[PDB]
Short mmCIF file of C-alpha atoms in Angstrom, two decimals:
data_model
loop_
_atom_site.label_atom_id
_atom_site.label_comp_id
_atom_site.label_asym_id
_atom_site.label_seq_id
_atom_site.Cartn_x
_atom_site.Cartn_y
_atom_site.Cartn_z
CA UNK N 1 133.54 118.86 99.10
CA UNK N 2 131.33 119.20 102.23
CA UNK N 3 129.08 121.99 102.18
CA UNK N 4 129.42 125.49 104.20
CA UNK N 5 126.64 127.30 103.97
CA UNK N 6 127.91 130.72 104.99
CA UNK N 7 129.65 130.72 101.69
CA UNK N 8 125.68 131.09 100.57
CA UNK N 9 124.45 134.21 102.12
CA UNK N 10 125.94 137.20 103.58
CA UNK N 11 124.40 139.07 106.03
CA UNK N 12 121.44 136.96 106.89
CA UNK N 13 120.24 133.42 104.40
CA UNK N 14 117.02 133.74 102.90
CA UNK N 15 115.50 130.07 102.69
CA UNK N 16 112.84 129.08 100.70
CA UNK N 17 110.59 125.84 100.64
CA UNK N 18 108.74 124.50 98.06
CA UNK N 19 106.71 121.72 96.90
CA UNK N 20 108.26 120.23 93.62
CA UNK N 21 105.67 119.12 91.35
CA UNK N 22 103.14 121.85 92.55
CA UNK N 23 100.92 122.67 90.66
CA UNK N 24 103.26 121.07 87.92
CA UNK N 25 106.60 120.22 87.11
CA UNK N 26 107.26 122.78 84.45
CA UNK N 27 106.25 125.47 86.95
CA UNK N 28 109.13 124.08 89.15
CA UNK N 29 110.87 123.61 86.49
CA UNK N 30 110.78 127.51 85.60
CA UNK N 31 110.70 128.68 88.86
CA UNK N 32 113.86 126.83 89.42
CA UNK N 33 115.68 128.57 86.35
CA UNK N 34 114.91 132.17 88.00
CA UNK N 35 116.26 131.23 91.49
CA UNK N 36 119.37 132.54 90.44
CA UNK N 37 117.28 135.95 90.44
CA UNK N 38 115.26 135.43 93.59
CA UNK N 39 116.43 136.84 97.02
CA UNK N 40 116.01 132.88 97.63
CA UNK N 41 119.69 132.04 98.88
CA UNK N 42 118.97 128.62 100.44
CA UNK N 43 116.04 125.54 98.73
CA UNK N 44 114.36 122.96 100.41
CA UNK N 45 113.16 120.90 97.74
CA UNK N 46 109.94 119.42 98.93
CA UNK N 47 109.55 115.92 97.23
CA UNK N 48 106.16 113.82 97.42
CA UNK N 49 106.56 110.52 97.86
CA UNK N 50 103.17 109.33 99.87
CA UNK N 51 99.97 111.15 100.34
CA UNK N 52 99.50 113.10 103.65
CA UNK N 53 97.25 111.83 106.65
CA UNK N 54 94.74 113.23 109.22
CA UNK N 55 94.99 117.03 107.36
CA UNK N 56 93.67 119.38 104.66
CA UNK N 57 96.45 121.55 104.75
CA UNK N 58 98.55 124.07 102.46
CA UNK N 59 102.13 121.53 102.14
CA UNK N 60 100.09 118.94 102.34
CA UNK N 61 97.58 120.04 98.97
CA UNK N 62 100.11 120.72 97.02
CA UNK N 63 101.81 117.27 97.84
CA UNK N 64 98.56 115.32 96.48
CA UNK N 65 98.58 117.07 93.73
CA UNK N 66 102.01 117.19 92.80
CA UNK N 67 101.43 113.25 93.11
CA UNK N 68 98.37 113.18 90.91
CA UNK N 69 100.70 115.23 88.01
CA UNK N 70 102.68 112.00 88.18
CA UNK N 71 105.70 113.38 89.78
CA UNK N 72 107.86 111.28 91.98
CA UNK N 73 111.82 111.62 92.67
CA UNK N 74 112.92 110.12 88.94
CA UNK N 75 111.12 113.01 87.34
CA UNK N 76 112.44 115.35 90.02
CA UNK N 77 116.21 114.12 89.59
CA UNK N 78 115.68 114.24 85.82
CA UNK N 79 114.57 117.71 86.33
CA UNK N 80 117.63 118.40 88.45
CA UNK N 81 119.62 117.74 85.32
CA UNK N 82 118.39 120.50 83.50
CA UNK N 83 118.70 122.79 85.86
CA UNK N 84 121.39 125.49 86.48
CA UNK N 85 121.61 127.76 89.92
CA UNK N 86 124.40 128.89 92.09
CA UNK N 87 121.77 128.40 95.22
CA UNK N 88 121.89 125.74 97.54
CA UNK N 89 119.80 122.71 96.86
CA UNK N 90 118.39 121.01 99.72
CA UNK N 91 116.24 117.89 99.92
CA UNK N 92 113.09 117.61 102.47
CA UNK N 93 112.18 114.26 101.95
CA UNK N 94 110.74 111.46 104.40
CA UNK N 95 112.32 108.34 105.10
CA UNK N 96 110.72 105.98 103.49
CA UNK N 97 111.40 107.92 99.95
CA UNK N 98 114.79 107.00 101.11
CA UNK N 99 114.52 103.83 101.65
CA UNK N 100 112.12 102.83 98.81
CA UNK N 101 114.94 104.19 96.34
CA UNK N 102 117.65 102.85 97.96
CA UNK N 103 120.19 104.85 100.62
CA UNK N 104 123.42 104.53 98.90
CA UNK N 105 122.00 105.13 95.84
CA UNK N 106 119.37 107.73 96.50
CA UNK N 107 122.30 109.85 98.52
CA UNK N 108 124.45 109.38 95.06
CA UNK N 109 122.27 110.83 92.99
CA UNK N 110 121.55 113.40 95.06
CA UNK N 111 125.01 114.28 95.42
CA UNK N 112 125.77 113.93 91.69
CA UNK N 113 122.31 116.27 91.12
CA UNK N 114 124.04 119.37 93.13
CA UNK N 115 122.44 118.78 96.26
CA UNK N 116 124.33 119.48 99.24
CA UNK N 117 122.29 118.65 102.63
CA UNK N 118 118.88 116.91 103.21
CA UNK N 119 116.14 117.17 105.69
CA UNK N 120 114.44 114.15 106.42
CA UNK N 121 111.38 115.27 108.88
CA UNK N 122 110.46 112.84 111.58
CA UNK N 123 113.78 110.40 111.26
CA UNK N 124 115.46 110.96 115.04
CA UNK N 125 118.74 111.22 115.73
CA UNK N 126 118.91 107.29 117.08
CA UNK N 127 117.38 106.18 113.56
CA UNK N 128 119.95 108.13 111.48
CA UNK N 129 122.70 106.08 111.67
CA UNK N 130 123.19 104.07 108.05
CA UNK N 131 121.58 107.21 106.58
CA UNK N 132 124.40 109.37 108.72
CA UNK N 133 126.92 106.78 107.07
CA UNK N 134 126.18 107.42 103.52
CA UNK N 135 126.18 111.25 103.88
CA UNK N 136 129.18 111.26 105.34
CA UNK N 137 130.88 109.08 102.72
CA UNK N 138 129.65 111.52 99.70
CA UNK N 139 129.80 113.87 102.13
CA UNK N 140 126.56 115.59 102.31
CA UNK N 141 124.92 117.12 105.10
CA UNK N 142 121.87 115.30 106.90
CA UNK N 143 120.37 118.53 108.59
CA UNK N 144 120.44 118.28 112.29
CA UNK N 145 116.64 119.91 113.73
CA UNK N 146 116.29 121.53 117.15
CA UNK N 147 113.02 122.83 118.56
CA UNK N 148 112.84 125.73 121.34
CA UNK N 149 110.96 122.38 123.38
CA UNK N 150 114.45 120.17 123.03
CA UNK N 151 115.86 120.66 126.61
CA UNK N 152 119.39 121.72 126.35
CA UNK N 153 121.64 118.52 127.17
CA UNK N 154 119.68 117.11 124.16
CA UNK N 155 120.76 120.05 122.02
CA UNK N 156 124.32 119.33 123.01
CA UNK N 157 124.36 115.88 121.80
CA UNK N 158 122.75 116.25 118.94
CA UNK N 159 125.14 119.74 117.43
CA UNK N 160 128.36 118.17 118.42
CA UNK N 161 129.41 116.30 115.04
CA UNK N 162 126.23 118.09 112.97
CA UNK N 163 127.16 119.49 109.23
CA UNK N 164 125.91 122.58 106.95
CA UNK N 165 123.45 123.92 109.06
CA UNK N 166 121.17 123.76 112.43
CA UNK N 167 117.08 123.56 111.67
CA UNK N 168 115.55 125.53 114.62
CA UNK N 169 111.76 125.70 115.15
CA UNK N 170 110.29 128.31 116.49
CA UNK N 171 106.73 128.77 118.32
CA UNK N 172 103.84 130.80 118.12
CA UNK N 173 102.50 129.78 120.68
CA UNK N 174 104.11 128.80 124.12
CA UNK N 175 102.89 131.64 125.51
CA UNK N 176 100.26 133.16 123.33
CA UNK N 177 102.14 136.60 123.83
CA UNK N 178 104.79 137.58 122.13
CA UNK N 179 107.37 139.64 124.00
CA UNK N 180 108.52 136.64 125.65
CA UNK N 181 108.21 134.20 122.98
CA UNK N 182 111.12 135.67 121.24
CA UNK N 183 113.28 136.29 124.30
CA UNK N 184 112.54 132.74 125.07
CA UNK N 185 114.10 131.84 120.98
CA UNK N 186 116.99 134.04 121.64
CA UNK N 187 118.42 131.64 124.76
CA UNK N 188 117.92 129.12 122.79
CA UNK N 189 119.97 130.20 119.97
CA UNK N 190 122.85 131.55 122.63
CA UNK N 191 122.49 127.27 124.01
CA UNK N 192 123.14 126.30 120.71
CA UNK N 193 126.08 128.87 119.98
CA UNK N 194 128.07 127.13 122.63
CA UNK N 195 128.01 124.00 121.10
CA UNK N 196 128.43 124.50 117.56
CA UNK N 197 130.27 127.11 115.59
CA UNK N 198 127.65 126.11 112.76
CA UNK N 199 124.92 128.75 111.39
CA UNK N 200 121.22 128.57 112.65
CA UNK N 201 118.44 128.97 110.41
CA UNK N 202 115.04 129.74 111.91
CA UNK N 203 111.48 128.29 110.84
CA UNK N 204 108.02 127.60 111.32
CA UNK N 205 105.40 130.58 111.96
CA UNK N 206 107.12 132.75 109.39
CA UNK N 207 104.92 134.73 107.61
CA UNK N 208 105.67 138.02 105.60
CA UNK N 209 107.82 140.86 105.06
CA UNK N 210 107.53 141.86 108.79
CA UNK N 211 108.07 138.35 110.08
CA UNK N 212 111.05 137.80 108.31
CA UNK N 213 113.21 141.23 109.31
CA UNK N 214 112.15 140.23 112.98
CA UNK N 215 113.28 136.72 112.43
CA UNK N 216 116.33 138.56 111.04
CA UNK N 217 117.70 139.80 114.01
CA UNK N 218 117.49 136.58 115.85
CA UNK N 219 119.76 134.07 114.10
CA UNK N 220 121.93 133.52 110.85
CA UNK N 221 118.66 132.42 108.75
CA UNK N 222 114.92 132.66 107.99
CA UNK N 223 112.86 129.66 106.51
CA UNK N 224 109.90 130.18 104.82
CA UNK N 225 107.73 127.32 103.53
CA UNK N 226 103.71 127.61 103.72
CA UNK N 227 103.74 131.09 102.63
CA UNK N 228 106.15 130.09 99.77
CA UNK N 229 103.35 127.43 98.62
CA UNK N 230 100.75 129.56 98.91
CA UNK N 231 102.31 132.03 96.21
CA UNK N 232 102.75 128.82 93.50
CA UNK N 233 98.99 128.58 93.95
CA UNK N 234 98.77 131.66 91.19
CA UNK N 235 99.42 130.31 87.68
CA UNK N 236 101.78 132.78 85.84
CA UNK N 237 105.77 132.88 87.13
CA UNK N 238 106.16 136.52 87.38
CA UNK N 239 103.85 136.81 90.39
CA UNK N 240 104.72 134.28 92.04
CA UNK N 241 108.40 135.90 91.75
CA UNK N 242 106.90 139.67 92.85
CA UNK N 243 105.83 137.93 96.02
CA UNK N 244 108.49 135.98 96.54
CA UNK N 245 110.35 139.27 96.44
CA UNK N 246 107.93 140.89 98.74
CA UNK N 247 108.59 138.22 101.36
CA UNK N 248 112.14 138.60 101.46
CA UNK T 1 91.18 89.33 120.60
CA UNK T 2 92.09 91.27 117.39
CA UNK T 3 88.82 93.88 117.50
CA UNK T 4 86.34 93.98 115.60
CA UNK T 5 85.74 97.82 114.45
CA UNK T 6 82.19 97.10 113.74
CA UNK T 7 81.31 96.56 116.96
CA UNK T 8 81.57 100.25 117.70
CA UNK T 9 79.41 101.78 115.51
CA UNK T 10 75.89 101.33 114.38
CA UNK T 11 75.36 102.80 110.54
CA UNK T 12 78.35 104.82 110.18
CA UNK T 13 81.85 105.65 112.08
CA UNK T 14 82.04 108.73 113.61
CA UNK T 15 86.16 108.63 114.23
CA UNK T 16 88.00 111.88 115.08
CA UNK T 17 91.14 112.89 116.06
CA UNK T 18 92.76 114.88 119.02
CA UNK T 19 96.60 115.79 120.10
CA UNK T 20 96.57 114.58 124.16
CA UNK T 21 98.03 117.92 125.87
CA UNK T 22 96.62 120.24 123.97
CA UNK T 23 95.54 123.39 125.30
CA UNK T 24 96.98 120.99 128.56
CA UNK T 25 96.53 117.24 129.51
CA UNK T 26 94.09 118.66 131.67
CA UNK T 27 91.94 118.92 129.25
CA UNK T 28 92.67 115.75 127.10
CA UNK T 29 91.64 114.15 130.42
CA UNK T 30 88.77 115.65 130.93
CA UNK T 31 87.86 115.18 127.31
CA UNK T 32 88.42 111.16 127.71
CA UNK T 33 86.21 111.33 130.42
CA UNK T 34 83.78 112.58 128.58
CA UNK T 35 84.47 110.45 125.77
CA UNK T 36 81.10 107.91 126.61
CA UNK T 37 78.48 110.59 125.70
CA UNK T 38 80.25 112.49 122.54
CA UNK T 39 79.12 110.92 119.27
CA UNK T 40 82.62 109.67 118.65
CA UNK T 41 82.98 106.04 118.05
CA UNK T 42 86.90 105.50 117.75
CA UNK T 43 89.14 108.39 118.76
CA UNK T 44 92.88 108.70 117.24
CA UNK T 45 95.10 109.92 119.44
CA UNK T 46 98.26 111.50 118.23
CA UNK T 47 100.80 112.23 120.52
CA UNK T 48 104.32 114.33 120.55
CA UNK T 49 107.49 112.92 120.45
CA UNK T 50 109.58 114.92 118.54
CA UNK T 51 108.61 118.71 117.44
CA UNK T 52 106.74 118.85 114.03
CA UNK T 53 109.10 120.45 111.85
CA UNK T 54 105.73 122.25 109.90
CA UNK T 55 105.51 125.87 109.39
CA UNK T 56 102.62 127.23 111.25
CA UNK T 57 99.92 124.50 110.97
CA UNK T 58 97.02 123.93 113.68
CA UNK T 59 98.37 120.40 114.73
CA UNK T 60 101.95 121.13 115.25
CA UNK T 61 101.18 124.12 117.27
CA UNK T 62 98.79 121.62 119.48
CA UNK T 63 101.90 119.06 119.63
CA UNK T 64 104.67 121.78 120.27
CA UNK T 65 102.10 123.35 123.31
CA UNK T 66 101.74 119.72 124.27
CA UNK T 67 105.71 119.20 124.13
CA UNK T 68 106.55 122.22 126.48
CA UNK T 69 103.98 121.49 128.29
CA UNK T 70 105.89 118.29 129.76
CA UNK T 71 103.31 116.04 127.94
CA UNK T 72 105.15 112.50 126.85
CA UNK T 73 104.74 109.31 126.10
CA UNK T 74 105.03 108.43 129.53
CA UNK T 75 102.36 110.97 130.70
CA UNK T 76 99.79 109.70 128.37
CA UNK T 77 100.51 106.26 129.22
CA UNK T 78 99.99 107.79 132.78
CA UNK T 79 96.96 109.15 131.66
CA UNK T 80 95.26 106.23 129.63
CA UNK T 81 95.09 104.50 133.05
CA UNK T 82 93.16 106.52 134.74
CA UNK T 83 90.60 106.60 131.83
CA UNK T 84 87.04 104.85 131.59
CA UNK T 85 85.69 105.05 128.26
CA UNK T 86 83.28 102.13 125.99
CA UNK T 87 84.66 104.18 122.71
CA UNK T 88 87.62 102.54 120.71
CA UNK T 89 90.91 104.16 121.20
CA UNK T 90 93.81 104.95 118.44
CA UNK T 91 97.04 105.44 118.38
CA UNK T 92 98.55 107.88 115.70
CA UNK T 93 101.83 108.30 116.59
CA UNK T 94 104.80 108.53 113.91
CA UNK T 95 107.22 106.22 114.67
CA UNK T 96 110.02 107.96 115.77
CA UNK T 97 107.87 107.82 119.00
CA UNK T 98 107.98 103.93 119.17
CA UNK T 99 110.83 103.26 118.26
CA UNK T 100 112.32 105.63 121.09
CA UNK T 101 110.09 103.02 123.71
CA UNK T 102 111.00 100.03 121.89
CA UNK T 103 108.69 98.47 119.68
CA UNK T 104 107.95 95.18 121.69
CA UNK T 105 107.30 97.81 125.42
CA UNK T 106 105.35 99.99 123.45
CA UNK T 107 102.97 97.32 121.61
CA UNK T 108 102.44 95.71 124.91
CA UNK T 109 101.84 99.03 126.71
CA UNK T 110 99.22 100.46 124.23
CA UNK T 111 97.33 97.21 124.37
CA UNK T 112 97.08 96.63 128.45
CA UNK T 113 95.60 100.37 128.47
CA UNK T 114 92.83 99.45 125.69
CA UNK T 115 94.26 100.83 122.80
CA UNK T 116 93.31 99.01 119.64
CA UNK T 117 95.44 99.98 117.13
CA UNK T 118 98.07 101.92 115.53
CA UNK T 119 97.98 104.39 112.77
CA UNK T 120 101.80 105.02 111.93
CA UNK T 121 102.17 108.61 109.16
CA UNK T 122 105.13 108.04 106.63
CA UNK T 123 105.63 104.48 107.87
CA UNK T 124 105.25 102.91 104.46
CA UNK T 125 104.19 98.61 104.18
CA UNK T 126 107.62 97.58 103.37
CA UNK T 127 108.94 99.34 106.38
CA UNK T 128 106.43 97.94 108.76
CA UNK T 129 107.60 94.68 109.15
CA UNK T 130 109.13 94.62 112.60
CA UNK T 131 106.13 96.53 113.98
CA UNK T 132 103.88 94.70 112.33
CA UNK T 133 105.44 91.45 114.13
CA UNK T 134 104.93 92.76 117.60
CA UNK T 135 101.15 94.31 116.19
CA UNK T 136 99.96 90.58 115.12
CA UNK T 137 101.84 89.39 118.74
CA UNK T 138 99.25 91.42 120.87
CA UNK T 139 96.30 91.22 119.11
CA UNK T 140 96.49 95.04 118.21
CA UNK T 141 96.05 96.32 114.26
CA UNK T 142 98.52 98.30 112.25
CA UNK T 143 96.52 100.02 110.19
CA UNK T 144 96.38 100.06 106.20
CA UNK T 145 96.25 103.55 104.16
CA UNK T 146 95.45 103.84 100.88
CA UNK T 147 94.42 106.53 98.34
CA UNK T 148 92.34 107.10 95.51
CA UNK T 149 95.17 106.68 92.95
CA UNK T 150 96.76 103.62 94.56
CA UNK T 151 97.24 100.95 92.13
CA UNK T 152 94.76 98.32 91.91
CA UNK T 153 97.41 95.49 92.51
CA UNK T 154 99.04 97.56 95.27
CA UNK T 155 95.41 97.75 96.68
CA UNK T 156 94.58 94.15 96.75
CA UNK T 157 98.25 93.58 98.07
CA UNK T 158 97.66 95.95 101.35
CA UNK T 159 93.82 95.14 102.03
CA UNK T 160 93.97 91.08 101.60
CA UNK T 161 95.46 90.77 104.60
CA UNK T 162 95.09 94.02 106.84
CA UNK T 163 93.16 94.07 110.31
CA UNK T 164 90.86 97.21 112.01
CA UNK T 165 89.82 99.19 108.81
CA UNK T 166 90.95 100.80 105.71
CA UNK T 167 91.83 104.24 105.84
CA UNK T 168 90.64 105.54 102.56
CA UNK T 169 92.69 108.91 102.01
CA UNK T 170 90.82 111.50 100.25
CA UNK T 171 91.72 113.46 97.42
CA UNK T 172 91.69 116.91 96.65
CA UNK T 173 93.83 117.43 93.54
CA UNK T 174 93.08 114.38 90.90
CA UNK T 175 90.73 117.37 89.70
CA UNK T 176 90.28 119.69 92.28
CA UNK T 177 86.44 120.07 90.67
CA UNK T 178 84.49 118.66 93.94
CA UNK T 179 81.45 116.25 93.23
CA UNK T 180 83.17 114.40 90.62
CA UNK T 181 86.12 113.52 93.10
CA UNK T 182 82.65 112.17 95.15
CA UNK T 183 82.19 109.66 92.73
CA UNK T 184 85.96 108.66 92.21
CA UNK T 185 86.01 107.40 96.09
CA UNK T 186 82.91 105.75 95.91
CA UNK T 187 85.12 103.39 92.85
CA UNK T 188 87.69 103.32 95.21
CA UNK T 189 85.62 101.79 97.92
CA UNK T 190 84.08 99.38 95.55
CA UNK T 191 87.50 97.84 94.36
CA UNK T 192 88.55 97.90 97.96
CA UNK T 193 84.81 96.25 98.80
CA UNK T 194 86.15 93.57 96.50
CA UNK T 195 89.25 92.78 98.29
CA UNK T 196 88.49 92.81 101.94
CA UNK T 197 85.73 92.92 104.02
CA UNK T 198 86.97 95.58 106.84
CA UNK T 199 85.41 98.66 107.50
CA UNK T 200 86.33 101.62 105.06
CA UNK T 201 86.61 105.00 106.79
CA UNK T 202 87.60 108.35 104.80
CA UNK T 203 90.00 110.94 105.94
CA UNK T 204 91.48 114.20 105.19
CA UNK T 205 89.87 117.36 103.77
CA UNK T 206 86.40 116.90 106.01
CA UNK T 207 85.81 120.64 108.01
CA UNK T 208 82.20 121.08 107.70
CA UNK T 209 79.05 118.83 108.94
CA UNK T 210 76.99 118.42 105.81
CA UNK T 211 80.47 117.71 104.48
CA UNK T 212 80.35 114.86 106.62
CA UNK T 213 76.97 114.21 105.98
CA UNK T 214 77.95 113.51 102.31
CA UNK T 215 80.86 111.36 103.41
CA UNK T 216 78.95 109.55 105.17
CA UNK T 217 76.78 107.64 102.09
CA UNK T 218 81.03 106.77 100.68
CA UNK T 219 82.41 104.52 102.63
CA UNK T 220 81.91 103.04 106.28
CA UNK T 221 82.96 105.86 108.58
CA UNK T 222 84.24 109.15 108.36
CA UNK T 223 87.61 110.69 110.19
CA UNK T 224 87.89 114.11 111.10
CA UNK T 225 91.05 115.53 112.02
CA UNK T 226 92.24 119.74 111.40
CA UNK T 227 88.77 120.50 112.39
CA UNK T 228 88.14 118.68 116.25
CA UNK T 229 91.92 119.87 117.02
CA UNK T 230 90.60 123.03 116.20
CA UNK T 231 87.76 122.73 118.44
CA UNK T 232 90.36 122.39 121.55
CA UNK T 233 91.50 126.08 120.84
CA UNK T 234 88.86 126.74 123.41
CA UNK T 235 89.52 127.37 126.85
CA UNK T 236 86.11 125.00 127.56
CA UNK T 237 84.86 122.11 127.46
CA UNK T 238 81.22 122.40 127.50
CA UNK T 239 82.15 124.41 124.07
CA UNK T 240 84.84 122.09 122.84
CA UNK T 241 81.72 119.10 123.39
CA UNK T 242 79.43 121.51 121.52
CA UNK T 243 81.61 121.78 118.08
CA UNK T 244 81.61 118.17 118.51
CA UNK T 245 78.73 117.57 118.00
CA UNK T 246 78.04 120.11 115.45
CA UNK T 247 80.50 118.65 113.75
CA UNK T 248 78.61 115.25 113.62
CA UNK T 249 74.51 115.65 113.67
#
């Protein structure tokens, strides 16, 4: 059945990204049989398909080198197989890891895997529409993402018929201070609320312990991805849980 | 006339990149302007079209202050015209941006305001084709990435044929264990060497100067991209220029 993701948190969703492969599959691997004790409710599965451009950065690291371990979306949908969590499974993927597999088929397996929604960064709205198709057909969510930037008739158009759940990015820095910043979050979350009924999870700047029970109060989700990474850097699973667990 | 990169640089490329409306457009036009006596030979320009869906990274910041700043397509565009510069100018742009304009406008656009080519992230080869249609149609490159671990084949496949330069992605993780990953891109450029004769210019991972300095005796050129965006967290240009230029003694 389509996916609704307030069956997978309470109060607030605590969601997680990480970079499979990094620094191995067999850390992913067991990190992925403990999510079912993590305060992790909600997965973006990072998957490297290409190596990263004009950077040096934390996702992007971990990407190279979860490319150099010789992982790619067969070993991570083989991995999928041995896997068992009640959490949500999301894929973050780019398009052309789509494409290269094939749509129909790459949205099958993902389906069959236990993966209910996917994030694909950088494909817009007007370029969705065969991979909007295919979702819908094996019903799976393709993540609809709003930015505190999108002016709100755009907003409107793009919630109206959106599934699972709404990606909003935050900023750091429209301002530079921070009073506002977060007033100016909250309208955007009340815009959204009129136009979907669907929850709104909340990314991008998030941080630590303090950032998430702020982020808390704001919408029905927090997203955590660079600091996530940065914890998988260590090289022993019960660490890497403690912070987790810190975080959250 | 499809340009020839080589034409803009005497031993090596100094190529760097910038987000246009970041701190303001203000300042990416005063930059431009200034363009003639920095040490950069080609300049990428990545714009905003969409807001990076990152978590917390210096160049999504610079394109989501660019964003609600009011700075589009259609600004820069605006912008590029009013512009004197001898230095090469690049487009990096994902594609969601061109597509949006329509590939044919935006091809045509980018060329009449003496942009040279495009450097498209996440667009793979086999996607390319369309763009790559209008690219050969104005006279403007699409450029080729590869890495250190691309295949040989796949390598001889994207480079016999590809116009502007190779961009020779760096690696940071076949090891992790530095000088050693040195010598792995100087093979790289030698089995690219044998397959084209385009310039080869290395990105990603370059912060430092005598980490450009090093970088420098690899390949052709040398891209740096984090770093100069980091520069522009400055609210001045004498001292944006001056990291510039520390950046590339």
């Amino acid at each position: 059945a389509m996916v609704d993701f307030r069956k997978f948190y309470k109060e607030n969703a605590n969601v997680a990204y990480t970079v499979l492969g990094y620094p191995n599959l067999q850390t992913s691997e067991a990190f992925l049989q403990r999510l079912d004790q993590s305060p992790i409710d909600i997965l973006e599965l990072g998957v490297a398909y290409s190596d990263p451009i004009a950077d040096g950065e934390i996702i992007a690291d971990a990407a190279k080198i979860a490319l150099d371990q010789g992982v790619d979306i067969h070993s991570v949908f083989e991995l999928l197989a041995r896997i068992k969590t009640k959490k949500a499974l999301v894929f973050m993927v780019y398009y052309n890891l789509i494409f290269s597999y094939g749509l129909e088929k790459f949205v099958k397996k993902a389906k069959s895997l236990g993966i209910c929604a996917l994030i694909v960064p950088e494909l817009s709205f007007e370029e969705s529409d065969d991979l909007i198709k295919e979702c819908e057909r094996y019903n799976i969510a393709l993540i609809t993402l709003v930015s505190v930037t999108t002016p709100k008739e755009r907003v409107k158009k793009l919630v109206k018929h959106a599934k699972g759940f709404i990606y909003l990015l935050a900023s750091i820095g429209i301002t530079g201070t921070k009073s506002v910043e977060e007033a100016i979050l909250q309208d955007k979350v009340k815009e959204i609320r009129s136009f979907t009924n669907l929850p709104i999870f909340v990314g991008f700047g998030i941080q630590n312990n303090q950032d998430v029970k702020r982020m808390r109060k704001v919408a029905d989700g927090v997203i955590v991805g660079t600091s996530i990474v940065k914890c998988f850097k260590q090289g022993n699973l019960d660490i890497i849980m403690k912070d987790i667990e810190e975080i959250f």
